[PDB]
Amino acid sequence: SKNRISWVGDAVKTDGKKSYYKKVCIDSETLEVGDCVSVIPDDSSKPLYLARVTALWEDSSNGQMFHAHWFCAGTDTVLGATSDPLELFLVDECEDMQLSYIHSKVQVIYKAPSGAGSATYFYQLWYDQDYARFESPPKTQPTEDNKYKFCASCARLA
Amino acid sequence: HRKVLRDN
Ligand SMILES: [Zn+2]
Numbered sequence A: 001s002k003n004r005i006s007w008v009g010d011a012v013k014t015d016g017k018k019s020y021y022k023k024v025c026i027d028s029e030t031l032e033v034g035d036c037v038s039v040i041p042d043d044s045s046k047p048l049y050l051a052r053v054t055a056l057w058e059d060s061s062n063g064q065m066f067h068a069h070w071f072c073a074g075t076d077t078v079l080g081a082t083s084d085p086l087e088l089f090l091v092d093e094c095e096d097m098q099l100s101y102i103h104s105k106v107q108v109i110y111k112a113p114s115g116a117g118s119a120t121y122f123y124q125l126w127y128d129q130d131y132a133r134f135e136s137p138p139k140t141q142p143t144e145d146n147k148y149k150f151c152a153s154c155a156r157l158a
Numbered sequence B: 001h002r003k004v005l006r007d008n
Helices: A152-156
Strands: A005-009 A018-021 A023-026 A028-032 A036-039 A049-059 A062-070 A089-098 A105-107 A126-128 A134-135
Touching: A036 A062
Parallel strands: none
Antiparallel strands: A005 A023, A018 A049, A023 A028, A036 A049, A036 A105, A049 A062, A062 A089, A126 A134
């Protein structure tokens, strides 16, 4: 909840009706144009709305405002849900909005296209096939007498 | 088109 709201810096453009700014302080946090921001929906139950702050201005009419450029999640698309809650999509949805509606500052990055990467097998845990369990890998050490042919599973199964 | 219509 944003209650203490102060402009940071002198105004960058003036409409003679709006006065635009580059930065605003809200509570302790400082927020610039291009930062991203979180908004609680009209339905508190629904997930948070996320947006980029594209402009900050003071209106003769209306007060201390910003323009939200919305993101949307998978569930707002043909896709239904999606594997990662952190996943987001650009969408051409906007709104002027009072700065006091801002829940929190958030971090949204762009994820450039990646390549397949190293296709190698990996393991993390040991499977006790007798008792149907996963443990952390047993740390059974070899001697220097049998290092050259050591099998950890021979060692335990003896 | 607006997406947040509450007032407070
Ligand atoms: Zn817009």
